[PDB]
Amino acid sequence: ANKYPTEQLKLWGKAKELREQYYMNYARAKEKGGIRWSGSAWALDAIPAGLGEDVYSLTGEPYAAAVAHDRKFAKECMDAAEAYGFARDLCSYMRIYWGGMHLNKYAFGGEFPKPDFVFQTQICCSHSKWYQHVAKEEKIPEFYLDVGVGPYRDMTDARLDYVANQLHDGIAFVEKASGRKFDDELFIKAVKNEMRSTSRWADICALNKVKPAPLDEKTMYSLYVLCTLSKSSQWCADFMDELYEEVKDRVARGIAAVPNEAIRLMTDTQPPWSFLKIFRYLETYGAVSIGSLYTFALEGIWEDKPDGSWGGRTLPWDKGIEINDRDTAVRLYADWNLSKPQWQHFYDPTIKSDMMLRIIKEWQVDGVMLHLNRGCEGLSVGIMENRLAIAKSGTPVMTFEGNMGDEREFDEVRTQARVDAFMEQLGVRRQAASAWSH
Amino acid sequence: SDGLFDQFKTWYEKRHDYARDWKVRTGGQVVATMCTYTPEELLIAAGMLPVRVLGAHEPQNVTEPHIFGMFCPFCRDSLAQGLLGRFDYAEGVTLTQSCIQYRQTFGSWRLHVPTVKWDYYVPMPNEVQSPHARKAHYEEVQAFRVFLQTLTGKEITDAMLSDALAVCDENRRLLRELYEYRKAADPKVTGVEALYASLTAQFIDKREHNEMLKKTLAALPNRKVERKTGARFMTIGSENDDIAFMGMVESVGATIVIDDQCSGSRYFWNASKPEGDVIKAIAERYCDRPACPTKDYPAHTRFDHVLGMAKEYNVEGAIFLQQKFCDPHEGDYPDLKRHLEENGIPTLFLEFDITNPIGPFRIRIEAFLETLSEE
Ligand SMILES: CC(C)(COP(=O)(O)OP(=O)(O)OC[C@H]1O[C@@H](n2cnc3c(N)ncnc32)[C@H](O)[C@@H]1OP(=O)(O)O)[C@@H](O)C(=O)NCCC(=O)NCCSC(=O)C1=CCCC=C1
Ligand code: SF4
C-alpha cells in the first residue's frame, strides 16, 4: 500500500534531451568544423576540451549501452564483430561498438561518424584492444592514459607523476592530432566542471540515504549517464546542480520514488539494459533499489565527510587550493580521477568489499542483488570475493548471472524467479526478526 | 633416449619437493610468484627462492566461491593450487601487474591461503611504450626493494642486486643459447625439451638451473638426433604450460621450433642492458621485454616480435593455443592471425579448459599437417 507521497521527476525531459543532444552533436560535429573524438566514459575528457567548445566525444560504453537497449541492432552489431573474427566472450560493449563501426551505422541515424582521434584511459585490459582495432580501421591517431598505479590510498609522488606526465603528453597529442592550439583557460574550466559534475553526482546519490528514497535506481540510470557522456562540460555540471536542487526538494517534502517502499535494495554492476523491467517488477513488492557502487561511483567522486559519512568530494577551491595554471590543473585532475571508487577493485577487491558494506550501512539497505556480469571483465573482477564479504556481514545477498550487453547470456525467466525467491527470503527474515525481538 | 633433459623433467614433476629441500639446504624463504613480470632479482637478492605459481591441469572445484567462472582456466587452476595447500611452504606471495584476471588469483590467494606471511603487488606500468614508464617502474622496483629490506631486516645492497641480476641475465642468455639449436634443420632440442628448461627456470634456484643449462649446452654439439623433424611449428599463447599437450603435437609429425608464450620465450627473451644503476637496469629489463598483450599499446609491437621469431626459426605453421575467456590474447588474435597468414604462415586455433581430452586436439593437429603439405 502507498504510505509515502510520490511524484515524477520534473527534470526528466531535460535529462533525456541533454543525452539526445550529445549524440546528435557528435554526428553533426563537422557541419561547422568541429572536432570529434572517441574513448571511454573514463577518458579524461577535459584534455580534448582544451581544444575548443566545439569538441564532441562519443564515449564507447554509454554508446554501446544505448545500442544494447535495441536488442535487434545489438545482435546485428555483435554478429558483424563475430564475422570479423573476434571471440564472442569478449566485452559485449566492445563487440557491439566494433560491429556497429563495420556496419557503418549510428544508433541515432546515419553513418557511423568517424572520430578524428582516440583519447582513451587504460585500466581494463580491453581498454587498449577496443581502440587499437578502431584506430586501425578508421586510420586515426590514438592516445592511451595508463592509470594503473595501484590503489588511491597507497598513492606515492612518483605514481602521481607518472599519470600527470602522461597527461602532458596527451595535451601535445591532441594538439597534433587536431591541428589546434590547446587553450589553458578552456582546459582549466573543463577540469573545474568535471570536478563539479562528479562531486555533485555523488551529492545527489547521498540524498538517497533517507527513507523513503527520493530516487529509484532505474530512474537514476537516466541521470548518472550524463557524466558518462561529458563530465567536463558546463552543461553536465550545471544540470547536476539543477538536479541536486530537485532531489533536495523531494527529500524536504518526504517524496518517495516508490510510494509503497518497504524494502531497500542495493545492486552492483552493469544491469542488463534490455531488461530494466525487473526493477518495476520489484516495485510491486515495495522494493526500491537505492543504487549501487556502479551507479554512485562509475563517475561520481567521493570523500569522507566530517561525520564519517560518504559524500561528494570537496572542490579544491572550497579548500583554499588555487587552480590557475596548466601544471597545477593537470596534477589536480590526475589526482581527482585516481580517487575514483570504481577503479580501486582493479587492484584490491577488499576495497570494493568495504565500499559495498559502507553503502549498505549508510543507505540503510535490506538486501543485495549482485549481477555476475559475463559481459564485462573490468567491473566483474573480484565479484565473488565481494559476495563473500557481504555474506559474512549478515546482510542478505543473492546473485544472478547475466551479460549487460548480450541478451544471449541472460535468462530472464530464471533471473526473475531468483529475485522473487529473494523477496520471499527478505519477508521471512523480517518475520523471524519481529518474532525474536517481539 | 639419451635422457639429457631428465633433470629438468624431474624438477618439473617434483617442483614442490625441490622447494622444501631448498629451504632445508639454504635456510631461505620461498615466494610464490605470479606473472612473469615479477622482478625476481629483488627476491633472489633478499635470499629467497621465487617459484612461479602454475596450474595442475586437473579437475578442481575449490575456486568457485572465489573466482567467477567467466574468468580463464589458468587463473582458477593457479588459485586452486594455493587453496589446496600445495604451496604451503611459501611464506610470500607477489604479483607484478598485467592481466586483470590474474590479479584475482593474487587477491584471493593472499586473503585465503593461511600460510601466507606477506604479500606485495607491484603496479608495473602497462604502457611500456610511454616515455614515462621506465621512471615509474624504477620507483616501483626501488619501493619493492625497500619493502623487502624492511621485511627481512637485512640491507639489500647494490652489490647484492647486481649479483642477482647477473644470475638472472646468465639464465636468460643460456636459455637463448639453448633456443639457437632449434633453428637447425634437425633440431638437437625438441620443443618439449625447451619447455621443460624454460618452465623450470621459473621455480628452480637460478644458480642451480644455470649449471644444468651449461651442462646441457656442453652436451648438445655431439648429441645424436634420431627423430625426424616433420613440420616446423610455432606455439603462441599466454602461458602454454601443458607439456603433455606439446608432447602430442611433436608425436604426430612435427617439431615445435619456437614459441611466443610465458612458459617460454616471453619470460626470458631479453637480458638487461649494461648499466651502472642496478635499479634502472632491473626495471628497464622488464619494460623492454617483449610485451604481454595487456602492455602492448598503442602499437602492436608483439606482431613484429612474433613474425620475426617465426622467420628466424623457419616456422611453417603457427598454432594459437588460447585459454578460454582470455581477453588480452583474444583482443590481439584476429589481427595477429592475419599478420602471420599474410606473411605466408598458415595458422591453427585451439582453445583450452583446465583439463581437456587430447583426442579432439590431435585430430585437429593432424588435419593442420595435411594442409601444410599442400602449399
Ligand atoms: C535510455 C535507457 C537505456 C532506457 O531509459 P528508460 O527505461 O527510462 O526508457 P525510456 O524509453 O527512455 O523512458 C520510458 C520511462 O520513462 C519513465 N518516465 C517517464 N516520465 C518520467 C519522469 N517525469 N520521471 C521519471 N521517470 C519517468 C517511464 O516510467 C518509463 O519507464 P517504465 O516503462 O519502466 O515505466 C536509460 O536507462 C539510460 O539512459 N541508461 C544509461 C545507459 C548508459 O549509457 N549507461 C552508461 C554506461 S557506461 C559503463 O557502463 C561503463 C563506463 C566505463 C567503464 C565500464 C562501464
Ligand atoms: S570489460 Fe568492462 S571495463 Fe573492460 S572495456 Fe568492457 S565495459 Fe570497459
Residue numbers in the entry:
A (entry chain A): 5 to 442
B (entry chain B): 2 to 376
Q: Could you pull the original sentences from the published paper?
A:
An alternative to the classical Birch reduction is provided by dearomatizing benzoyl-coenzyme A (BzCoA) reductases (BCRs) from anaerobic bacteria. Architecturally, the heterotetrameric enzyme complexes are composed of two functional dimers: the ATP-binding dimer coordinates a subunit-bridging [4Fe-4S] cluster and serves as an ATP-dependent electron activator, whereas the catalytic dimer is predicted to contain an FeS cluster in each subunit and the substrate binding site. In this study, we heterologously produced the active site components BzdNO from Aromatoleum sp. CIB and provide a first X-ray structural characterization of the catalytic dimer of a class I BCR with the BzCoA substrate and the dienoyl-CoA product in van der Waals contact with the catalytic FeS cluster.
The dearomatized ring of dienoyl-CoA remains nearly planar; only the C4 sits slightly outside the plane. Instead, it catalyzed the reverse reaction, the methyl viologen-dependent rearomatization of dienoyl-CoA to BzCoA.
